[PDB]
Design a protein around this ligand. Structure first.
Ligand SMILES: [K+]
Ligand SMILES: [K+]
Ligand SMILES: [Zn+2]
Length: 356
């Protein structure tokens, strides 16, 4: 009955040399780590070491070409770092980026290993750069390699290929990369909640809509919960978990839960424009703990308000550690959120008896 925590300050080295105020800041992870220490959560966790992912582990989800191109950035001069970064949608690269991306992934592999060998029950990974926009063949949206997707494959690689992995992506952005990597796969259930605005919200693709339910044997194993019509918060997230995320997850019966835990749906986030509270994140976490005999790994994705992300992720770790959830879903839903939830219910009732 132990919670693992992984954090390595070396992941701060990845930086934007042209815009030191770019929101994907080095201090995102050091601020979260500090708050864990302040709240005396850190001393209650078992510290899991970071490590580098290997290139063979990266190839679980990524092309050899993509891996080698990002690796080639290690010795580039600034002009070529700028040129390479510009080939992608919303990427900056420094000489340390590749190393940091390897540490973020390797850290999560060690955490998944710790859970699956029984060394810990659950774990939190305070890592950057993030992962869920990264595609098999390309970088995107501050992400180089798809850490959560890789971790799902890594977990299968030390157990069995068909190990049932649930990935819950509550970053305010759609994890386009994660959806695509698993779109034809019934062994990995992908559930994302995300601001959509009929395609106006990053990453601006209809792939994020509720009617994208998976392909082939993966049909039904991709669940998009898209928000339209501005600010959402605890009531809408709690309702989506109540009507969709938890009934589907229970029916799937995952053997491991990975959370693509961005905290940019948080109150105060400059990119997300939503108002999920730290208490709200605590309740989301506590619900997921009822799955997979408690085998939950929380992986940092986005989240850009340093105070908001520090408080929110610390609350998640407090839940993992077995603390009582804080008092909380204070309001009727925005009408467009009701419409969203009902659209997803209609889209997935053919696949999940729990929705009928
Ligand atoms: K998401
Ligand atoms: K899937
Ligand atoms: Zn995000």
């Amino acid at each position: 009955p132990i919670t693992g925590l992984v954090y390595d300050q070396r992941m701060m080295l990845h930086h934007n040399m042209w815009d030191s105020h770019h929101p994907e800041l080095p201090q995102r992870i050091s601020r979260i780590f500090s708050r864990h220490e302040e709240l005396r959560l850190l001393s209650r966790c078992h510290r899991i070491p970071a490590r580098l992912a290997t290139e063979e582990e990266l190839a679980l989800c990524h092309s050899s070409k993509h891996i080698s191109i990002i690796k080639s950035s290690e010795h580039m001069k600034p002009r070529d770092l700028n040129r390479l970064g510009d080939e992608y949608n919303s990427i900056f690269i420094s000489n340390e980026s590749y190393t940091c991306a390897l540490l973020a992934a390797g850290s999560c592999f060690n955490s998944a290993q710790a859970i699956l060998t029984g060394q810990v029950r659950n774990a939190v990974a305070i890592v950057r750069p993030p992962g869920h926009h990264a595609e098999k063949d390309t970088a995107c949206g501050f992400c180089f390699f798809n850490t959560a997707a890789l971790t799902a494959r890594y977990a299968q690689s030390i157990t069995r290929e068909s190990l049932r992995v649930l990935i819950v992506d509550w970053d305010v952005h759609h994890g386009n990369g994660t959806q695509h990597i698993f779109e034809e796969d019934d062994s990995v259930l992908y559930i994302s909640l995300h601001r959509y605005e009929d395609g106006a919200f990053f990453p601006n693709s209809e792939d994020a809509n509720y009617d994208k339910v998976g392909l082939g044997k993966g049909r039904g194993y991709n669940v998009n919960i898209p928000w339209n019509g501005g600010k959402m918060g605890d009531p809408e997230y709690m309702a989506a978990f109540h009507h969709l995320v938890m009934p589907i997850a229970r029916e799937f019966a995952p053997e491991l839960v990975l959370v693509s835990a961005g905290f940019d749906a948080a109150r105060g986030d400059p990119l997300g424009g939503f108002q999920v509270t730290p208490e709200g994140y605590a309740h989301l976490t506590h619900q997921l703990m009822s799955l997979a005999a408690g085998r939950v790994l929380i992986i940092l994705e986005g989240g850009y308000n340093l105070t908001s992300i520090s408080e929110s992720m610390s609350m998640c770790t407090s839940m993992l550690l077995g603390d009582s959830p804080p008092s909380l879903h204070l309001t009727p839903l925005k009408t467009s959120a009701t419409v969203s939830i009902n659209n997803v219910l209609r889209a997935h009732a053919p696949f999940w008896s729990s929705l009928r």
